[PDB]
Amino acid sequence: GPVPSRARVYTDVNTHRPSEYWDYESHVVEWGNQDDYQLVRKLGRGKYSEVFEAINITNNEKVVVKILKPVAAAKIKREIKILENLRGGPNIITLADIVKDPVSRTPALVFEHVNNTDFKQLYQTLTDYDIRFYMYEILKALDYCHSMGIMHRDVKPHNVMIDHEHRKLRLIDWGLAEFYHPGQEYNVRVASRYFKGPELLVDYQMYDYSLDMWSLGCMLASMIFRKEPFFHGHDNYDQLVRIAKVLGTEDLYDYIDKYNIELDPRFNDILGRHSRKRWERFVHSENQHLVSPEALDFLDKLLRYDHQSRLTAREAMEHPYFYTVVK
Ligand SMILES: O=C1NC(=O)/C(=C/c2ccc3ncccc3c2)S1
Ligand code: NA
Numbered sequence: 001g002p003v004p005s006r007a008r009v010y011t012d013v014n015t016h017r018p019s020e021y022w023d024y025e026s027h028v029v030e031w032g033n034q035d036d037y038q039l040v041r042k043l044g045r046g047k048y049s050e051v052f053e054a055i056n057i058t059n060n061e062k063v064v065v066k067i068l069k070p071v072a073a074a075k076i077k078r079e080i081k082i083l084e085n086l087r088g089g090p091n092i093i094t095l096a097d098i099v100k101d102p103v104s105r106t107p108a109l110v111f112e113h114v115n116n117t118d119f120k121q122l123y124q125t126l127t128d129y130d131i132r133f134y135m136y137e138i139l140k141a142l143d144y145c146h147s148m149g150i151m152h153r154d155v156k157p158h159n160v161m162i163d164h165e166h167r168k169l170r171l172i173d174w175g176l177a178e179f180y181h182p183g184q185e186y187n188v189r190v191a192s193r194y195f196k197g198p199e200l201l202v203d204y205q206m207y208d209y210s211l212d213m214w215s216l217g218c219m220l221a222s223m224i225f226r227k228e229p230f231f232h233g234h235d236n237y238d239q240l241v242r243i244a245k246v247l248g249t250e251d252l253y254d255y256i257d258k259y260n261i262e263l264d265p266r267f268n269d270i271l272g273r274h275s276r277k278r279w280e281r282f283v284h285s286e287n288q289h290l291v292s293p294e295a296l297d298f299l300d301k302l303l304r305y306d307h308q309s310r311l312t313a314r315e316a317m318e319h320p321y322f323y324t325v326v327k
Contacts, residue, residue, distance in 0.1 A: 003260040006182045007208035009312050013149040014179050022149065022179040024081035025074070029107065032097035037065055037110060048072050048175060053113070056096070062113035063096060068106045076107055079175045082150055083109070086174075089148070091141035093161070093170045114170050120157035122164055123223050128290050131223045132325045134162065134169055136317065138216065141171040143313035146209040152177050153190040155215035157222075180208055191215060193239055194229035198252070198305045201240040202261050210307040213316070217302030224295050226287040241270050247305060248276035255305040294321040 014022045040053040043064065052065045068076050083095040097110035119134075126134070138160060145152060152159075154176040161170045176190050185205035191197070197214035199207045221230035231246070233239025244252055249271055256263050279296040298321040301311045311319070 001260065002204060002206070002262075003258070004183060005204075005206045005208070005259065005308065007180060007210070008308060009314070010146050010149060010180070010209065011182050013147070014181055017149070021085065022081075022181075024077045024179075027077055027081045027084075029077075029080060029098055032099045032110070034099040034102055034108070036097070037063060037099065039065060046173070046175070048075070054110070056110075064111045064113050065101075066109040066111065067101045067104050068108065070104070070106050072106075075175065079177065080107070080109070082174050082177045082179075085148055086145055086150065089141065089144040091137050091169050091171055092144060093172045093174075111172070112170075114161040114168070114172075115163045115165070116161040117164060118158065119160040119162045119169075122162055123157055123219070124226060124228060126223065128292070128295075129324065131220075131290060132322060133167070134160075135216075135220060135223075136322050136325050137169040138171065138219075139313050139317050141169075142209075142212055142216065143317065145171075145177070146180075146212070146313055149180050150177055151180055151209045152212050154192065154195075155212045155219070156192050156195045157219060158192075193233055193236060194218060194231055196236070196239060197307065198240065198243060198255065199307050201236060201243075202256060202263060204259055204261050207307060210310050210312070213302055213310045213313065214307070216316075217299060217310070220295075220299050220302065221282075224287065224290045224299065225282045226290070227282070237264075237266055237270060240267065241272070243305075244271055244274050246277055247303065249274045251276065251305050258306065292321070294319070294323075297321070 036056055036058050037054045038057055040055055043051045043053055048069045048071060049066045054063050054065045056063050080098060086092045087095055094112040095109060096112055099108050101108040154173055159173045161172055186207060188200040188203055188205060195215040195218045197211045218230055222228050231239060231242040233242045279300060283291050298319045304310045
């Protein structure tokens with residue numbers, strides 16, 4: 001069968017912890033007072049939640065309330081525990097409270113409010129400097145959660161809240177996040193289509209933090225090339241074909257060979273044969289001011305089939321692309 005894989009950083013962080021850190025099922029929630037929060041406006045609906053702007057009437061500060069659906073099948077406890085474990089980390093959304101919603105009767109998570117324009121609305125208008133600046137801020141969040149034994153598994157523009165006026169960023173929606181345990185096989189039905197790593201698309205379950213670095217690379221490519229999304233698959237199958245048209249098929253087949261993966265036979269009729277395109281093929285008059293040799297080398301080192309070969313978040317922060325950003 002498939003050959004096993006282990007993360008090359010933060011491999012055993014959870015194994016050394018007391019079980020309370022990662023055994024989210026045994027976590028006992030401390031409840032706040034639902035009357036502290038008055039709902040202001042409906043912001044939108046998640047797959048398992050509904051999200052509202054609200055006011056904390058005890059300090060009159062804006063907050064956001066995420067009321068979870070009872071269809072969660074025990075997944076509420078995981079998100080709560082992960083949010084509490086990561087609270088205070090750089091650029092991690094702050095869980096301010098947990099209350100029991102009086103109408104739905106499910107847990108409602110209370111977050112700090114971010115005066116964002118949501119990143120997907122903004123990330124196609126940024127200057128070269130601002131792409132580098134905000135990418136570095138996202139990397140602070142990812143290295144923090146990875147170093148804490150957690151993979152986000154849903155990195156995408158919608159899940160990065162950016163207050164562009166104040167140049168502040170928060171990584172949100174930890175509802176798909178999971179604790180990394182070496183040797184564990186995970187569900188591949190995570191992340192959003194355009195940001196899914198090759199490991200998910202080829203059904204390789206023993207993945208790790210490096211999944212988030214693929215998703216980050218997809219965001220970077222969309223920003224520097226002004227192409228939304230960069231890999232524009234019509235479904236999960238065509239998604240891998242779109243990747244192969246850029247990265248080539250012989251490296252894909254080498255990845256499959258290395259991990260002893262049984263490629264879904266459906267790919268035989270759609271993958272074709274493709275050679276890697278040099279990154280300069282995607283440069284044009286409208287995006288060339290966002291492209292530099294450093295940007296292309298950095299992207300090249302994120303968007304690799306082999307999850308063990310991609311830059312880690314800390315390696316990424318060391319890259320020359322960020323030498324221009326004030327630290
Ligand atoms: O589905 C979700 N999961 C989260 O973790 C969310 C967090 C969040 C935080 C702050 C916000 N500020 C303004 C507007 C929306 C906001 C949303 S929404
Ligand atoms: Na820097």
